[PDB]
Ligand binder design. Sequence first.
Ligand code: NAP
Ligand code: OG7
Length: 181
Amino acid sequence: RTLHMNLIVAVDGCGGIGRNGGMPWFLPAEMARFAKLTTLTTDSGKKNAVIMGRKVWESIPPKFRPLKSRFNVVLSKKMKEESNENVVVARSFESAVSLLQDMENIETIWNIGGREVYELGLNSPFLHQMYITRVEGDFLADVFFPRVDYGRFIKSTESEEMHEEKGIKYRYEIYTIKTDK
Ligand SMILES: NC(=O)c1ccc[n+]([C@@H]2O[C@H](COP(=O)([O-])OP(=O)(O)OC[C@H]3O[C@@H](n4cnc5c(N)ncnc54)[C@H](OP(=O)(O)O)[C@@H]3O)[C@@H](O)[C@H]2O)c1
Ligand SMILES: Nc1nc(=O)c2c(Cc3ccc(C(=O)Nc4ccccc4C(=O)O)cc3)c[nH]c2[nH]1
């Protein structure tokens, strides 16, 4: 085998995710949870995969650019091939998903996004869960999360407190596709 593609995103009050090619906020604790959720595997020795658009890859600091302990797939029609063994450039979403499903040591595909990547994942058969961090307020984003029918999902009822860093408040949400749930 089973292979799950889980989308992971942090949206503001207007569903915005990005502003001026970068993120509208800095939340170290939320980013630490992101790294944990996208890195940990039930079977050690197996790895997780992160599939991202070109602009997300460019928004990752070059010192951390190949996301450690995770196999990196970058969708791009323009970038040259990446010589690194942990990064691979895929020219289409279907080819990227096929390449990931071929690799046996990949446990879970974490769609970390870009709007087009989020939409493609939302239409993928491997779609399992959405891990949505809902941030309060309007950060005047220029790039947004795709429109999505939450009626396709079941919202997990675990107790979710409010979190706050640097006066920025947010809360975690987990949705599971109704086909699986
Ligand atoms: N808050 C969050 O959780 C969050 C998450 C992700 C991103 N963001 C923000 O949002 C922005 C990045 O997202 P974005 O939507 O602007 O861009 P993106 O999807 O990250 O990157 C777009 C690029 O990816 C490539 N691409 C996408 N789908 C493809 C496909 N099916 N086949 C081939 N190539 C494909 C193309 O590369 P070429 O241009 O080379 O063809 C395209 O121009 C930044 O502002 C970032 O900080 C925020
Ligand atoms: N929720 C949610 N938040 C996001 O920021 C986001 C992004 C963009 C992004 C994704 C990852 C990083 C990054 O390098 N992060 C880390 C930070 C500290 C320690 C380790 C890591 C690591 O992963 O190694 C930065 C930016 C895509 N999708 C997202 N979803």
